[PDB]
Design a protein around this nucleic acid. Structure first.
Ligand SMILES: [Mg+2]
Ligand SMILES: [Zn+2]
Ligand SMILES: [Zn+2]
Lengths: 50, 1342, 90, 49, 99
DNA sequence: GGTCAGTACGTCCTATCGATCTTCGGAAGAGATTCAGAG
RNA sequence: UCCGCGGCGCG
DNA sequence: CTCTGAATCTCTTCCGACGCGCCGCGGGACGTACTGACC
């Protein structure tokens, strides 16, 4: 959706945006695994375990 | 229309004010409220100032242009335009005289110094609290004597009417009118001749200057007391209608109303024969009201309106940042302008910018209207406006037609230097954001985080051609400050080229042999080969021959695929070595500079565009990204921290044992933590910079890492070593708000998390830096404005002045380090003398040759150590500089053209980098070479060593090539083991002196006796407690007996038979003298050898403030003392911390005398010989002393060296031409020693150009010229001392400049740039220069 | 079209004199009705003047010579008109 | 604000100096579309004549 | 924001300031210094005289641009006349010589 | 003489200084006061 | 339409 | 021991980056009676 320049991070030393960018990806990934599990109409047990 | 040659300023006579006026204002009313019409005789009166509406009478009897010029009989309002209300002034006839506050309070008081009366007494007389005497007969009273009311009554009773005494402005005016200017001038000149006191001489000469100015100007002193008060035209003080029936009023209206009320009340009281007290009070109130109207707040509390804010007076209208000069005349709001947020246009060519279509339509509206009416689409202007408002398609086609080759000016604030405004051809774009070319951003200092830029439209043909030829971005590829390229690749552009030009040990397609760059591109785009694959490529390159024709050579070169693909875009003429390397920012900038020097402007522009395109494309293809894994932490970091903690624990235990002090403990802990930080940084960089790859043979090999952060930092695209350290190593020790370093550093990095404590510690530095930037901006701006104001007059006005004078340029070397090579300091300057091949008499470089790159290379080849170049400070041009003295135009490479405003360029070049400046016993030879000693006198001791008997001795190292690259200062009495001209090895160390000890040396061997060495009176002899040995100590004047003041302990040398020893080569006996607190280890009659030393005597701010102090020529706190004349030294008699020193010239009949506070460590001894400029006592050197003792070249060298030291420490590159320009502007004033046959007066301050021209014409007529000294004025004082009063008034201190110009009756000839900017005519620089020359022709013909 | 004025600068020798000469020629082409000496190529009078300067067809001396020729022709036309008026009167 | 998919890479100079390149999908989904309300007033006043 | 011509201030007779007032951009003293560093005398004159304060100048420039003549007829800025009147209102006779 | 327009005076409103917002740093110049040297 | 003051924000 | 000049101290005045945007608040005006000039 958005392309950001890598060059700002080193000079600016705002590394927190990189870590967030990582964690957000993980935050999305879990959701994706839920979303597919909801699209497949899987049992509540597997959803609860995940 | 009515072209004027000058602007004259003088005092206004009452008759002059009446001549200006169109009527008397005698009512304190503005408008009737029943009818919104001005009052009959008020401040807005129609029959005094003009009609309210154009060509319409006030009563409406006449309402058309046919009645033009008719004065109505019913109401007396002339039928004319309303614009006359903007011009016509009025007047108020004051019932009592009132003193002008400017001529009373603006120091120095013009009335006070004209009458030789103290300011407080004149204030007391004016404000009706004391009397003054005007005329006296046989009475005891004296003229100008002040009398209290009781004293006045006593005098009246004693003498009746034989004496005249009055109060107030009437009395002051009577005193002023009753003064004979010529007689007073003659009497004051006689007194000045008779007087001996220097303070009396200064007062007398300033009073004589004031009186002579009054005589010459034609102004009368009594005009300083106002009898008629001018009234400003109503349109300049408008009565603006508001919502709700209220009227917004200017404060001037309130001030005038107060003055009119007081005046009318005083007149009524005078008519009714009111008592003396009431009329005196009313006169005082009228005086206060007029003072408030003229300059509110200068005396007493400023009168305030209902908002409790002081009312704005006329002085406030002229003065200040918000005054007319700076807000309305030197700068303006302009039509045909817009602004918007800027974005990147990466598709743009260098000469074009993306302009929004709506902005273009609005800005070019009149052009569109004209082109619509030309094509018959719109019959009238209203139809054209309706068409454009509807935004029809034909309107868009017309707009595309009108902007085709019409440049627009883009400007970003602050405009620190001239690159802040540049011209571009506009390409119309959709959207509301201006698109800016990436390469111009560095010159603009523009990023795309929210910047807004302003757009201006050149209207006239001359404006369009100036935009195209002078201001367009294609002409601005070199920085005028230093000559280096300013349109330089950055960010992604640099990273992409760096990624393109890097090699990998084993890569796809390694070892292939390519037909050319095209095959490399084919292999890369097909995926068959990597960019970093090492391959042999056939390359054809071109080189210019001696005739300038490109000769081609083809060869197979080891290269990478990316380097060949990049070579595809390189212009013909450049070597392949310019691309056969990993290209960082410096390499690309150097490549562009080489292209400009070899091939010119157009190939360089094309090359820059292609470089930008290629860098962007290959940075995109690289997919360079920053991830958390790229911040690699050393594995050694934890153990380094543990070792450092162990060391600090050991030091803590040692301190608890009491073995070390608290300060020593603090220093030791800081040192060990700094060492740990260095180790962590070294480990981080070592791990980052290298990676291991498997080569073609299957073996591990090290190569430069492709880590993203390392690639960004190494390429120079972004980042640095310190920032990488903070990311991947410990970010180090932090300073408290007071500047002291915290004992425990921030051990964590930014990839790791800082603790709460560490973050709180870092915030101190963060906020300190932010606030420092906030203040630094203001300081730098003030400095830049001062520099511009001092240098704005200077323009190149002739080709060659014919001066053989110049300055000597040598490489700047400090402490064995060559801080600046000669090539940088001499490139682009014109040789003042012919340079000879070293060691021969053959001419290597002829005189008057501009030293371009080839000449500098030739100078380097022959190893020339010093050159003599022409300087701006040495130019003989009057009212300008010649093109040869200035030298190369740094922005264009060639010699500077006539008409270039070099002063503004210099000021901008110095001021722009201001915000980057900070605001808040052993000598070891480093290189193999030979040793040379200068300003040295030497003796040999019994040990065979060398002792130096000179205090200005310099030690230099010379290489076999003939160059010198070391410099040191050798203290007096230092011992050296090497002779002059000897050879020394690398690392050899020779130095022997004590900084805490001042030695005393003897010439020849003999026996030493004592004279005037008597216990108690002068000395004390004792067996010391420290060692138990005999010792002699010399007492100070505050410690010895009073009777021994004239007895000075001395040492005398005798031979083996007791005969007095004479100094070799002289008849002077060998005698030595000991100062106070000196200690002599020897006894009476002990033997010494030749060159024997026996003496035991006891012994910061930089940055932008340093530059400001250097340019303001501020004296140091404890300036060094310099010998004023060459001669022999002698001492005198001291008293309470002061000493007298006498220098007897070798032949001069007048010995100089000086007084020295004895707390200064006097360097020279009583028997030494000195030369003018020699350091008598060490310390900071006052620039004024340097100018008056060593000369102009010395002071300019000192200022240039110091300013360049500051800038070079910060890393800024500014050519010395600009500092020399500022220095020349500082040396513009001279003082006269002997008038000779000229009309000047001794001690007067004149322009150096004027005295130079007068001496030239006198010598042409054979008369004796006037002798002069030169004065070093600071930039502020130099700006305020200009002959143009308009420029000085526009700069600062408007009241003082205006008052002095009014009393002096000055005439401004409008020679400078600022004056013509105020007037609104073409500046005498650039395209306008020729125009002014035509003026100079016509006034010559007339 | 034009991007750099370096060639015209070399022809004239000074950027300021170049601007003055080009402005004079462009004003001749725009208001004075003079025809260009080079193909227009949709360029404006500013760029056409610069291109004429580049080819060496226009400089200060050439413009002065052309203006002197035009003034002489105008004086000749005035003399011819006076002669015709005299012939009509005679 | 909004959660946005972000790639850290240079892209043809459209991220040159802090600049941001945005997908058209962001605009189509109205993710940063905002509503602004302006108050405009017309005032009738007593005037002379 | 963009402006070609609009309202002018009462006293300074110069373009208004601000987008809300449809004003023009301020060509401050640093911009004047930038133009003086170049040889841009004609551009500087047209910004000082015609585009800001000269009333007759700006009217004639607008008419000439509509007529297709990009020529300037500069006059005296009105702010200088205001300055002269303000100095004369202080009792100082300031005048232009050899008009 | 009578009428209209213009001009003049009053009201809002005082009465203690007390309301009132109030307090930088650096450099230069002018004036006043003090110390040292000479008589 | 002008001026002033206060507050806030961006480059 | 006193006087004058020079030096030092105290007090006052001037200067302090540019450009742009938004909001709020404030800012003498109105009424009545009397006098003079014109018809
Ligand atoms: Mg920015
Ligand atoms: Zn009338
Ligand atoms: Zn010269």
């Amino acid at each position: 959706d958005i392309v950001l320049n890598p060059l700002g991070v080193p000079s600016r030393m705002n590394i927190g945006q990189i870590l967030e960018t990582h964690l957000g990806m993980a935050a999305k990934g879990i959701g994706d695994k839920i979303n597919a599990m909801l699209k497949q109409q899987q049992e509540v047990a597997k959803l609860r375990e995940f | 229309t009515e072209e004027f040659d000058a602007i004259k300023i003088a005092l206004a006579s009452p008759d002059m004010i009446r001549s200006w006026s169109f009527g008397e204002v005698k009512k304190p009313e503005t408008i009737n409220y029943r009818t919104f019409k001005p009052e009959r005789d008020g401040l807005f009166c129609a029959r005094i100032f003009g009609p309210v509406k154009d060509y319409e009478c006030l009563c409406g009897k006449y309402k058309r242009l046919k009645h033009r010029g008719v004065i109505c009989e019913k109401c007396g309002v002339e039928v004319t335009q309303t614009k006359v209300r903007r011009e016509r002034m009025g007047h108020i006839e004051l019932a009592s005289p009132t003193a002008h506050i400017w001529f009373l309070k603006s120091l120095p008081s013009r009335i006070g110094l004209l009458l030789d009366m103290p300011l407080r007494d004149i204030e007391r007389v004016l404000y009706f609290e004391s009397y003054v005497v005007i005329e006296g007969g046989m009475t005891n009273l004296e003229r100008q004597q002040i009398l209290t009311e009781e004293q006045y009554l006593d005098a009246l009773e004693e003498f009746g009417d034989e004496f005249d005494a009055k109060m107030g402005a009437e009395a002051i005016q009577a005193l002023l009118k009753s003064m004979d200017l010529e007689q007073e001038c003659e009497q004051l000149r006689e007194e000045l001749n008779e007087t001996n006191s220097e303070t009396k001489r200064k007062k007398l000469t300033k009073r004589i200057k004031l009186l002579e100015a009054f005589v010459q100007s034609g102004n009368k002193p009594e005009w300083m007391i106002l009898t008629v008060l001018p009234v400003l035209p109503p349109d300049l003080r408008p009565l603006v209608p508001l919502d709700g029936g209220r009227f917004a009023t200017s404060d001037l209206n309130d001030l005038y109303r107060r003055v009119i009320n007081r005046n009318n009340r005083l007149k009524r009281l005078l008519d009714l024969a009111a008592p003396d007290i009431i009329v005196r009070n009313e006169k005082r109130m009228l005086q206060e009201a007029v003072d408030a109207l003229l300059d509110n707040g200068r005396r007493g509390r400023a009168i305030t309106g209902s908002n409790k804010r002081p009312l704005k007076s006329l002085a406030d209208m002229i003065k200040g940042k918000q005054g007319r000069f700076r807000q309305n005349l030197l700068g303006k709001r302009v039509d045909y302008s817009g602004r918007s947020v800027i974005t990147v246009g990466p598709y743009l060519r260098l000469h074009q910018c993306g302009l929004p279509k709506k902005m273009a339509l609005e800005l070019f509206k009149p052009f569109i209207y004209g082109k619509l009416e030309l094509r018959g689409l719109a019959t009238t202007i209203k139809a054209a406006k309706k068409m454009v408002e509807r935004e029809e398609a034909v309107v868009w086609d017309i707009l595309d037609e009108v902007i085709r080759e019409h440049p627009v000016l883009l400007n970003r604030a602050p405009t620190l230097h001239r690159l802040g405004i540049q011209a571009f051809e506009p390409v119309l774009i959709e959207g509301k954001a201006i698109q800016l070319h990436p390469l111009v951003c560095a010159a603009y200092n523009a990023d795309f985080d929210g910047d807004q830029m302003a757009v201006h439209v050149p209207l006239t043909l001359e404006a369009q051609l100036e935009a195209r030829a002078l201001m367009m971005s294609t002409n601005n590829i070199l920085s005028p400050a230093n000559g280096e390229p300013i349109i330089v690749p950055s960010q992604d552009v640099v990273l992409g080229l760096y990624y393109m030009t890097r090699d990998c040990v084993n890569a796809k397609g390694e070892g292939m042999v390519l037909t050319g760059p095209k095959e490399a591109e084919r292999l890369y785009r097909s995926g068959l080969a990597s960019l970093h694959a090492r391959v042999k490529v056939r390359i054809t390159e071109y080189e210019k021959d001696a005739n300038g024709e490109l000769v081609a050579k083809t060869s197979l070169k080891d290269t990478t695929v990316g380097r060949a693909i990049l070579w595809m875009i390189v212009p013909k003429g450049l070597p392949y070595s310019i691309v056969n390397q990993a290209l960082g920012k410096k390499a690309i900038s150097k490549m562009l500079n080489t292209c400009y020097r070899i091939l010119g402007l157009k190939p360089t522009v094309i090359f820059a565009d292609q470089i930008m395109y290629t860098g962007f494309a290959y940075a995109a293809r690289s997919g360079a990204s920053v991830g958390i894994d790229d911040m690699v932490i050393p594995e050694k970091k934890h153990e380094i921290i543990s070792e450092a903690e162990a060391e600090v624990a050991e030091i803590q235990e040692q301190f608890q044992s009491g073995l070390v002090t608290a300060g020593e403990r603090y220093n030791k802990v800081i040192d060990i933590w700094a060492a740990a930080n260095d180790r962590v940084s070294k480990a981080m960089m070592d791990n980052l910079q290298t990676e291991t790859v498997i080569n073609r043979d299957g073996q591990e090999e090290k190569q430069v890492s492709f880590n993203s952060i390392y690639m960004m930092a190494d390429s120079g695209a972004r980042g640095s070593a310190a920032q990488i350290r903070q990311l991947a190593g410990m970010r180090g020790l932090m300073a408290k708000p007071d500047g002291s370093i915290i004992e425990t550093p921030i051990t964590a990095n930014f990839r790791e998390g800082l603790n709460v404590l560490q973050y709180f510690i870092s915030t101190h530095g963060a906020r300190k830096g932010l606030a420092d930037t906030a203040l630094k901006t203001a300081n730098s701006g003030y400095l830049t404005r001062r520099l511009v104001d001092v240098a704005q007059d200077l323009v190149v006005t002739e080709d060659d002045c014919g001066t053989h004078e110049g300055i000597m340029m040598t490489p700047v070397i400090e402490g064995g380090d060559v801080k600046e090579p000669l090539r940088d300091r001499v490139l682009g300057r014109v040789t003042a003398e012919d340079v000879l091949k070293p060691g021969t008499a053959d001419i290597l470089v002829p005189r008057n040759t501009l030293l371009h790159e080839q000449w500098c290379d030739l100078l380097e080849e022959n190893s020339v150590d010093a050159v003599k170049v022409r300087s701006v400070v040495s130019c003989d041009t009057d009212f300008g500089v010649c093109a040869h003295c200035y030298g190369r135009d740094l922005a264009r490479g060639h010699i500077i053209n006539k008409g270039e405003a070099i002063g503004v360029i210099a000021a901008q070049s110095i001021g722009e980098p201001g915000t980057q400046l900070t605001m808040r016993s052993s000598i070891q030879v480093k290189n193999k070479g030979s040793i040379k000693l200068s300003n040295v006198k030497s003796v040999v001791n019994s040990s065979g060593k060398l002792v130096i008997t000179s205090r200005n001795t310099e030690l230099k190292l010379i290489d076999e090539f003939g160059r010198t690259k070391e410099s040191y200062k050798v203290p007096y009495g230092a011992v050296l083991a090497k002779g002059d001209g000897e050879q020394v090895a690398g690392g050899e160390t020779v130095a022997n002196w004590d900084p805490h000890t001042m030695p005393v040396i003897t010439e020849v061997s003999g026996f030493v006796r004592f004279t005037d060495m008597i216990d108690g009176q002068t000395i004390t002899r004792q067996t010391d407690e420290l060692t138990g040995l005999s010792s002699l100590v010399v007492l100070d004047s505050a410690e010895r007996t009073a009777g021994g003041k004239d007895l000075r302990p001395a040492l005398k040398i005798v031979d083996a038979q007791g005969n007095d020893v004479l100094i070799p080569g002289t008849d002077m006996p060998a005698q030595y003298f000991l100062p106070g607190k000196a200690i002599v280890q020897l006894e009476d009659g002990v033997q010494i050898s030749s060159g024997d030393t026996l003496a035991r005597i006891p012994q910061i701010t930089g940055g932008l403030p340093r530059v400001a102090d250097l340019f303001e020529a501020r004296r140091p706190k404890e300036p060094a003392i310099l010998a004023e004349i060459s001669g022999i030294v002698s001492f005198g008699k001291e008293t309470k911390g002061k000493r007298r020193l006498v220098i007897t010239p070798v032949d001069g009949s007048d010995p100089y005398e000086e007084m020295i506070p004895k707390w200064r460590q006097l360097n020279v001894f009583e028997g030494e010989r000195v030369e003018r400029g020699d350091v008598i006592s060490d310390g900071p050197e006052a620039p004024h002393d340097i100018l008056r003792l060593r000369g102009v070249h010395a002071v300019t060298r000192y200022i240039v060296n110091e300013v360049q030291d500051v800038y070079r420490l910060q890393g800024v590159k500014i050519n010395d031409k600009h500092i020399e320009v500022i220095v020349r502007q500082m040396l513009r004033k001279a003082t006269i020693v002997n008038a000779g046959s000229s009309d000047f007066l001794e001690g007067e301050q004149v322009e150096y150009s004027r005295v130079k021209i007068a001496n030239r014409e006198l010598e042409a007529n054979g008369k004796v010229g006037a002798t002069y000294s030169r004065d070093l004025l600071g930039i502020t004082k130099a700006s305020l001392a200009t002959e143009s009063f308009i420029s000085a008034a526009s700069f600062q201190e408007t009241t003082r400049v205006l008052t002095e110009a009014a009393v002096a009756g000055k005439r401004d000839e409008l020679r400078g740039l600022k004056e013509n900017v105020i007037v609104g005519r073409l500046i005498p620089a650039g395209t306008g220069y020729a125009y002014h020359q035509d003026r100079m022709r016509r006034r010559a013909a007339g | 079209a034009r991007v750099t004025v370096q060639d015209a600068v070399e022809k004239i020798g000074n950027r300021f004199d170049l601007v003055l000469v080009a402005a004079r020629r462009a004003r001749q082409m725009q208001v004075g009705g003079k025809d260009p000496l080079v193909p227009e190529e949709n360029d404006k009078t500013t760029v056409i003047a610069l291109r004429e300067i580049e080819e060496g067809l226009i400089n200060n001396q050439i413009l002065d010579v052309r203006e002197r020729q035009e003034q002489q022709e105008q004086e000749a036309a005035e003399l011819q008109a006076v002669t015709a008026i005299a012939e009509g009167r005679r | 604000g909004q959660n946005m998919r972000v790639a850290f890479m240079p892209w043809n100079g459209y991220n040159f100096e802090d600049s941001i390149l945005v997908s058209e999908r962001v605009v189509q989904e109205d993710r940063f579309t905002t509503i602004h309300i302006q108050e405009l007033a017309c005032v009738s006043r007593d005037t002379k004549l | 924001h963009a402006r070609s011509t609009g309202s002018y201030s009462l006293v300074t007779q110069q373009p208004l300031g601000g987008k809300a007032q449809f004003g023009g951009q301020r060509f401050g003293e640093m911009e004047v210094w930038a133009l003086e560093a170049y040889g841009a005398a004609y551009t500087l004159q047209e910004m000082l005289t015609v585009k800001s304060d000269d009333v007759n100048g700006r009217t004639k420039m607008y008419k000439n641009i509509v007529d297709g003549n990009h020529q300037m007829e500069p006059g005296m800025p009105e702010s200088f006349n205001v300055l002269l009147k303000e100095i004369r209102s202080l009792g100082i006779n300031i005048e232009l010589e050899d008009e």
